[PDB]
């Protein structure tokens, strides 16, 4: 019987009913549920306790449940609503329970207050409120960092719904693109940060788009101290941090005051990377009336264009000037937009301010002169009437350094480059720095060969990348050549700039002149290049042969080998304008092993019917020969044909001789070791060049054509020449002459005991045929 | 009875123990919660339903609720832990009776899982903590407008709690104002009308201020329309200003761009203007650690104050600084203090760039832009190479004394260009190891490599000199002195130089100027010993106390005698012996290499004049000019002279030069050899020079002999490429009839391989010690002809 009195105290309501529906037993939980009595509840049937619109239903029902036959009931299982006595309604909750006996049906209903109907109700506000007109990504965050609870921009944002967002970090959730080193670490760092902390990030949405956010952490504690949670908000500062950036681009511009345009500039390409696919435009107050101060490269029509257009204001709020974009429709949001232009209008009106606040004579970056150095230089080029060559050199690509990492190093970067440029320049040759990025070189030579290999070697000195702090930035050259007689230095500045500004337009990384027929003239003598390149490739070139034989007994002594060209297009070239030509080329290694290589052939093929040619010489200062050819150039040329090696000569001037480094004396060395003769010029330098000398045994002498002209003329000369043959007739050596061409030469020469004689007086130079027959018909020539 | 199979089939959890605390009763929810069988549990005591962590604990409660014996049990109001058959620990709640009945006590249990149910407080405190960090006041409303739930920041905005403004009307709590007719009224529409307006008004604080707030009411349509609950997002349209303020103020103070303290300060100062009571602090971060940078004057003590730590990053992201602002609690929100901390980080972030930048471009800027020299960073470095070099410096500090007076009269456009014109002196004399910069102002500095005080008193001399000239302007004289300090010591760094040599610019300038001086007297009794010296040798000179001392040279294979060397010497009572390579420089240094040369030359054309007595004696006789330093102005004149007073065929003597000299250059001294050649001066040459130019000049006036240095003789038996060489300047030398001849012979194996190379003539020890002028006569005819 326990169940009743058990019931009754307890406080779960309780109401029990029979097979008639008849009550029995009614707690006074259930008591003070309803508000009737219990001499009361029982009345007819269950009548009083249901509501009385849902009444009609409740038979039917309890009657479906014994016709069911189910031992549980799935009804009553969620909320319902109880009409109290008074009509007042309420929220509670039921269970029910069937039983069988004694052939009848019973049923037993619980009941609870429903007290947590105001919790669901309350979770189900701040549900809402949480996501309603608030999109600010919010998340929370267990002692272990993990995402406990997101809210519907979060999810919205970051593509991760709560059900693929919970049950792992935030930073194991997020897709992270590699900085790699930042965003990695610090997004870590952070997460794990104790204190309240924030930073900004690079993120990958589940969707691969880049966006750039800011995160804050800020941990909560409950009353006895412990850590319970931590919050954290996702703000979304992609915009933001454009703007920022644009902050520091313009503010690294301002630090060092560029001109007033070059301001505009950097205004206005911070702009467009700020807005992308606009147009900006500037105009600043001068005199009183606005005036256009820049506007951007881009001209072309945009399609659905809306323009704003905003009046730069100073301090005093007196107008200054007019800043203008035009940004396609669609393309960024108002806001945005307005943000930018405001910002930018006062970042402009500040650098209005330091502009009118700035409103020696060397250079104390690099020590160079300044503008006011070279004008000055320049004038006195011009009173005493002296032209010029002026060179304006413009450094390009220094854009990125600016951009990347502000001036105190672009600065840096122009700092290497002048020293790069002296360190190969030529004294008489002017260096001067003309404002931030330019400079002019002054020199007084006006070839064009020379100008062209100084220009060839100025934009070859940056070939190599300029190494700044494990950072390649590659920087270019644009340099403007002008030159012209009798014109004041204000024209040759403006020519060479425009020339300047002309090749960095059209791309840079080069050169050009003013005036356009030499500029036409170099192209010229660059088709004359080409064509002596294909000349050079397919050996078409000759090697005209000249003998030189003894003044005593005409017996041949030798012949010398010299390179002639005689081309169709071209005709006849001499010696020496297609070898400094070929120089300017820099393929003189190809036409000295040609001409050794011909040679040992021509050597062969005489040998054939003739052995008898005693000596060919080849003249290798002529030549241009480099210093590390020698060695291959010679022996592959000995081994190849069956030339035997004390046969042919070769020639070499004072200065390369032991000047211009010293490898090249031991590449002598080992040629003579081969055996091959030898020929100097001036053997000077003093008694160490004599002793080089005798040490490297040459055997032969050679006197230039001009000492042996004018050896009638001048008695200077003339006892130089008795000095000459006889310090070679004390010595092993045979000495030699040319440029003979009279009779009276031959006759003096002779007088002096030298020994052998070469030139027009005995042999005009006869081509590669009837040198034999020179050879067979008149070589004892016994004048 | 019913009630068993009933607990049998609730959904309630239905659990009777007796008297003697043992499970009688247990059901499917049972089941579902303890998670052990009935099979297991019918017949087990109370303890097993018992949790582990209140065992011990577990039945005195009951005892003492039997004692009381109320029905009303007191316990189990609160909720219980339970642990699972399998360790896991779930939430559950208990309804309790106690029965009385049979004469025996009895405890019904009945158990609801209430997992949803405290899942679902949880959710609400966590959904609590979530809104309340919403930058935003926000709040909710019913279909009526009761204000449901509100959060922290209205909270904060205006002081209103959840309990205080809990369902009441918005306008109620709103406290609206009651003078503004239409902002009351369309407060009210936007409160009652359901569009989603955002319009904006005046509110009223419990501090009694007016405040702009943004209402954005969006009522919230349900899926079975008839909309019922509304949304609230309150907005502050005063605090953007104040922050786009800040914003522009704090870039104006960038933009003058003021020393780091000066704009930490005014970063600080700002912040502080926006927040009403507030203390401010920055810390920018060097080698780790924080140096205080600016705070606030402002330093009075403020109650329970609120902090905030930011953490300024780099341009690349490296951590730079600390920013701590403290505020009065309640007087701004959390979000406002939040943002001027993020807009003041960037800003500090962009002045530690700026100042990381201005070291970086100082590092290397003014290198002296008016005269172009190298200033003193440019100094610093190259001492610090230098002595990274371990090679020790001499550095002058130089400093000119008239121009203070001149800056004083006539002004900076006068002594600018008196400095513009010393500097160019200076550059005139210059040397490719001699480095010039300028300190600052009226001071330089020279460094040099040379530690002979022979040298540098010299080079402090030219330098001294080269304001012999007093310097024009504007056809006005000014004669500008220096006075110098020069430092030179091994190991010591370049600060000690620096600091000495400066005090040795004091002495050497408040004495009076125009002057040089060392900074140490372990080095300046060089240079007091010296001028007494030089006085010596100017008395020795007018007197005529010096000696020459007469060396012969004889032919290689005759024997005989081909001539005489002569060589001069000084012997001093108080110095001694003095060699010629030691007062030869000292006679330059006082500039009288001039009266040494004729002294030297007539003292020979005495003694061959004295000779000429007994006999003609002397084949030749030689004078080396180029160990006598001769200058361009010196050679005809004084040989001249000397046979012309005297009586000398010029047969007799020959000149030696080194051919150094022989150039060109700017004086021309060929007329000057060949006039000499003219009038019978033997010639002798040590080298010839360039190329055929030279050996054309050697040969066209007629270089009678040519001389092989001591140093090439003395290694003729080691190498042989010497010996070459000898054999090319003896062939030549017979070619053009030059009388090769050999200084400094010693053995007997040299002078016989020397004639099997044909020298002609030997000049050393091998046959005479440079003999004291007498005894020559008491050797010409005893050692004879030496045909050894
Ligand atoms: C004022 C008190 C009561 C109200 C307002 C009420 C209301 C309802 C409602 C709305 C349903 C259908 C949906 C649902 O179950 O949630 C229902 C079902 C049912 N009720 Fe009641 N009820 C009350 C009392 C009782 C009592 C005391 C008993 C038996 C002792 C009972 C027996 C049943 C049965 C058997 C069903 C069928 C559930 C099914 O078929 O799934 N009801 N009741
Ligand atoms: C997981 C199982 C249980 C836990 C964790 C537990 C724990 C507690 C604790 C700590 C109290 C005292 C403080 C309070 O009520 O908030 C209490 C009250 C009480 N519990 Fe338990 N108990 C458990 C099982 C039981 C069982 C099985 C019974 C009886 C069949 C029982 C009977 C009582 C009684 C009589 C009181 C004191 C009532 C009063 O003083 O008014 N408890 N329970």
Same mark, same amino acid.
């Given at each position: 019987?326990?169940?009743?009195?058990?019931?009754?105290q307890?406080?779960?309501?309780?109401?029990?009913?029979?097979?008639?529906?008849?009550? @029995?037993?009614?707690?006074?939980?259930a008591?003070?549920?309803?508000?009737?009595?219990?001499?009361?509840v029982?009345?007819?049937?269950?009548?009083?306790?249901?509501?009385?619109?849902?009444?009609?239903?409740?038979?039917?029902?309890?009657?479906?449940?014994?016709?069911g036959?189910?031992?549980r009931?799935?009804?009553?299982?969620?909320?319902?609503?109880?009409?109290?006595?008074?009509?007042?309604?309420?929220?509670?909750?039921?269970?029910?329970?069937?039983?069988?006996?004694?052939?009848?049906?019973?049923?037993?209903?619980?009941?609870?207050?429903?007290?947590?109907?105001?919790?669901?109700?309350?979770?189900?506000?701040?549900?809402?409120?949480?996501?309603?007109?608030?999109?600010?990504?919010?998340?929370?965050?267990?002692?272990?960092?993990?995402?406990?609870?997101?809210?519907?921009?979060?999810?919205?944002?970051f593509?991760?719904?709560?059900? #693929?967002?919970?049950?792992?970090?935030?930073?194991?959730?997020?897709?992270?693109? /590699?900085?790699?080193?930042?965003?990695?670490?610090?997004?870590?760092?952070?997460?794990?940060?104790?204190?309240?902390?924030?930073?900004e990030?690079?993120?990958?949405? *589940?969707?691969?788009?880049?966006?750039?956010?800011?995160?804050?952490?800020?941990?909560?504690?409950?009353?006895?101290?412990?850590?319970?949670?931590?919050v954290?908000?996702?703000?979304?500062?992609?915009?933001?941090?454009?703007?920022?950036?644009?902050?520091?681009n313009?503010?690294?511009?301002?630090?060092?005051?560029?001109?007033?345009?070059? @301001?505009?500039?950097?205004?206005?390409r911070?702009?467009?990377?700020?807005?992308?696919?606009?147009?900006?435009?500037?105009?600043?107050?001068?005199?009183?009336?606005?005036?256009?101060?820049?506007?951007?490269?881009?001209?072309?029509?945009?399609?659905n264009?809306?323009?704003?257009?905003?009046?730069?204001?100073?301090r005093?709020?007196?107008?200054?000037?007019?800043?203008?974009?035009?940004?396609?429709?669609?393309?960024?949001?108002?806001?945005?937009?307005?943000?930018?232009?405001?910002?930018?209008?006062?970042?402009?009106?500040?650098?209005?301010?330091?502009?009118?606040?700035?409103?020696?004579?060397?250079?104390?970056?690099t020590?160079?002169?300044?503008?006011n150095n070279?004008?000055?230089?320049?004038?006195?080029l011009?009173?005493?009437a002296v032209?010029?060559?002026?060179?304006?050199?413009?450094?390009?690509?220094?854009?990125?350094?600016?951009?990347?990492?502000?001036?105190?190093?672009?600065?840096?970067?122009?700092? #290497?480059?002048?020293?790069?440029? *002296?360190?190969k320049l030529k004294?008489?040759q002017?260096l001067?720095?003309?404002e931030?990025?330019?400079?002019?070189?002054?020199?007084?030579?006006?070839?064009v060969?020379?100008?062209?290999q100084?220009?060839?070697?100025?934009?070859?000195?940056?070939?190599?990348?300029?190494?700044?702090?494990?950072?390649?930035?590659?920087?270019?050259?644009?340099?403007?050549?002008?030159?012209?007689?009798?014109?004041?230095?204000?024209?040759?500045?403006?020519?060479?700039?425009?020339?300047?500004?002309?090749?960095?337009? +059209?791309?840079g990384?080069g050169?050009?002149?003013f005036?356009?027929?030499?500029?036409?003239?170099?192209?010229?003598?660059?088709?004359?290049?080409?064509?002596?390149?294909?000349?050079?490739?397919?050996?078409?070139?000759?090697?005209?042969?000249?003998?030189?034989?003894?003044? #005593?007994?005409?017996?041949?002594?030798?012949?010398?080998?010299?390179?002639?060209?005689?081309?169709?297009?071209?005709?006849?070239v001499?010696?020496?304008?297609?070898?400094?030509?070929?120089?300017?080329?820099?393929?003189?290694? +190809?036409?000295?092993?040609?001409v050794?290589?011909?040679?040992c052939?021509?050597?062969?093929?005489?040998?054939?019917?003739?052995?008898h040619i005693?000596?060919?010489?080849?003249?290798?200062?002529?030549?241009?020969?480099? =210093?590390?050819?020698?060695?291959?150039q010679?022996?592959?040329?000995?081994?190849?044909?069956?030339?035997?090696g004390?046969?042919?000569?070769?020639?070499?001037?004072?200065?390369?001789?032991?000047?211009?480094?010293?490898?090249?004396f031991?590449?002598?060395?080992?040629?003579?070791?081969?055996?091959?003769?030898? =020929?100097?010029?001036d053997?000077?330098?003093?008694?160490?060049?004599?002793?080089?000398?005798?040490?490297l045994?040459?055997?032969?002498?050679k006197?230039?054509?001009?000492?042996?002209?004018?050896?009638?003329?001048?008695? *200077?000369?003339?006892?130089?020449?008795?000095?000459?043959?006889?310090?070679?007739?004390?010595?092993?050596?045979?000495?030699?002459?040319?440029?003979?061409?009279?009779?009276?030469?031959? /006759?003096?020469?002779?007088?002096?005991?030298?020994?052998?004689?070469?030139?027009?007086?005995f042999?005009?130079?006869?081509?590669?045929?009837e040198?034999?027959?020179?050879?067979?018909?008149?070589?004892?020539?016994?004048?």
């Open positions: 019987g326990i169940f009743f009195p058990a019931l009754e307890n406080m779960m309501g309780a109401v029990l009913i029979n097979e008639n529906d008849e009550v @029995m037993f009614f707690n006074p939980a008591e003070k549920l309803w508000g009737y009595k219990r001499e009361e029982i009345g007819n049937n269950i009548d009083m306790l249901i509501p009385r619109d849902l009444r009609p239903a409740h038979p039917e029902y309890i009657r479906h449940n014994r016709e036959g189910k031992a009931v799935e009804g009553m299982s969620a909320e319902l609503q109880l009409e109290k006595k008074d009509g007042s309604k309420i929220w509670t909750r039921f269970a029910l329970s069937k039983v069988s006996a004694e052939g009848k049906v019973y049923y037993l209903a619980l009941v609870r207050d429903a007290s947590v109907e105001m919790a669901q109700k309350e979770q189900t506000r701040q549900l809402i409120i949480a996501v309603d007109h608030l999109d600010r990504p919010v998340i929370v965050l267990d002692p272990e960092r993990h995402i406990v609870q997101c809210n519907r921009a979060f999810t919205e944002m593509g991760y719904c709560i059900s #693929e967002a919970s049950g792992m970090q935030p930073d194991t959730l997020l897709n992270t693109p /590699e900085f790699p080193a930042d965003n990695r670490i610090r997004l870590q760092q952070l997460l794990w940060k104790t204190a309240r902390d924030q930073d990030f690079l993120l990958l949405t *589940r969707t691969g788009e880049k966006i750039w956010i800011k995160a804050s952490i800020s941990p909560v504690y409950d009353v006895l101290a412990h850590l319970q949670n931590l954290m908000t996702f703000s979304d500062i992609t915009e933001e941090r454009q703007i920022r950036q644009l902050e520091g313009i503010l690294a511009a301002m630090c060092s005051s560029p001109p007033f345009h070059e @301001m505009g500039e950097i205004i206005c911070n702009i467009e990377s700020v807005l992308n696919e606009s147009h900006v435009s500037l105009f600043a107050l001068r005199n009183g009336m606005p005036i256009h101060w820049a506007s951007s490269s881009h001209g072309a029509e945009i399609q264009a809306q323009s704003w257009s905003a009046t730069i204001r100073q005093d709020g007196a107008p200054a000037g007019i800043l203008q974009i035009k940004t396609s429709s669609g393309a960024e949001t108002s806001a945005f937009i307005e943000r930018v232009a405001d910002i930018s209008q006062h970042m402009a009106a500040l650098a209005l301010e330091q502009e009118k606040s700035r409103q020696i004579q060397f250079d104390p970056m020590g160079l002169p300044n503008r070279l004008h000055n230089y320049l004038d006195d011009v009173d005493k032209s010029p060559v002026v060179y304006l050199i413009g450094v390009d690509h220094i854009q990125d350094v600016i951009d990347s990492l502000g001036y105190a190093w672009a600065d840096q970067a122009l700092l #290497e480059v002048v020293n790069r440029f *002296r360190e004294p008489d002017y001067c720095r003309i931030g990025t330019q400079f002019v070189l002054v020199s007084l030579e006006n070839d060969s020379n100008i062209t100084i220009a060839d070697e100025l934009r070859n000195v940056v070939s190599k990348p300029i190494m700044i702090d494990d950072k390649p930035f590659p920087l270019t050259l644009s340099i403007g050549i002008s030159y012209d007689l009798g014109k004041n230095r204000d024209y040759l500045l403006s020519t060479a700039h425009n020339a300047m500004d002309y090749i960095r337009k +059209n791309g990384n050169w050009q002149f005036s356009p027929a030499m500029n036409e003239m170099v192209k010229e003598r660059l088709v004359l290049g080409a064509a002596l390149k294909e000349a050079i490739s397919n050996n078409q070139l000759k090697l005209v042969y000249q003998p030189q034989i003894f003044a #005593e007994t005409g017996e041949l002594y030798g012949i010398e080998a010299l390179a002639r060209w005689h081309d169709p297009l071209h005709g006849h001499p010696p020496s304008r297609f070898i400094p030509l070929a120089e300017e080329i820099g393929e003189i290694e +190809n036409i000295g092993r040609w050794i290589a011909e040679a052939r021509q050597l062969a093929e005489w040998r054939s019917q003739n052995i005693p000596a060919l010489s080849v003249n290798l200062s002529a030549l241009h020969f480099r =210093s590390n050819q020698l060695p291959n010679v022996s592959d040329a000995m081994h190849a044909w069956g030339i035997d004390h046969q042919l000569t070769v020639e070499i001037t004072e200065s390369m001789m032991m000047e211009h480094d010293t490898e090249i031991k590449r002598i060395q080992i040629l003579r070791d081969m055996g091959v003769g030898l =020929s100097v010029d053997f000077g330098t003093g008694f160490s060049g004599l002793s080089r000398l005798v040490s045994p040459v055997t032969e002498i006197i230039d054509k001009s000492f042996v002209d004018r050896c009638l003329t001048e008695k *200077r000369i003339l006892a130089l020449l008795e000095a000459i043959t006889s310090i070679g007739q004390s010595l092993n050596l045979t000495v030699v002459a040319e440029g003979v061409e009279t009779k009276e030469q031959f /006759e003096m020469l002779r007088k002096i005991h030298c020994r052998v004689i070469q030139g027009y007086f042999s005009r130079p006869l081509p590669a045929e040198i034999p027959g020179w050879m067979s018909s008149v070589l004892p020539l016994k004048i």
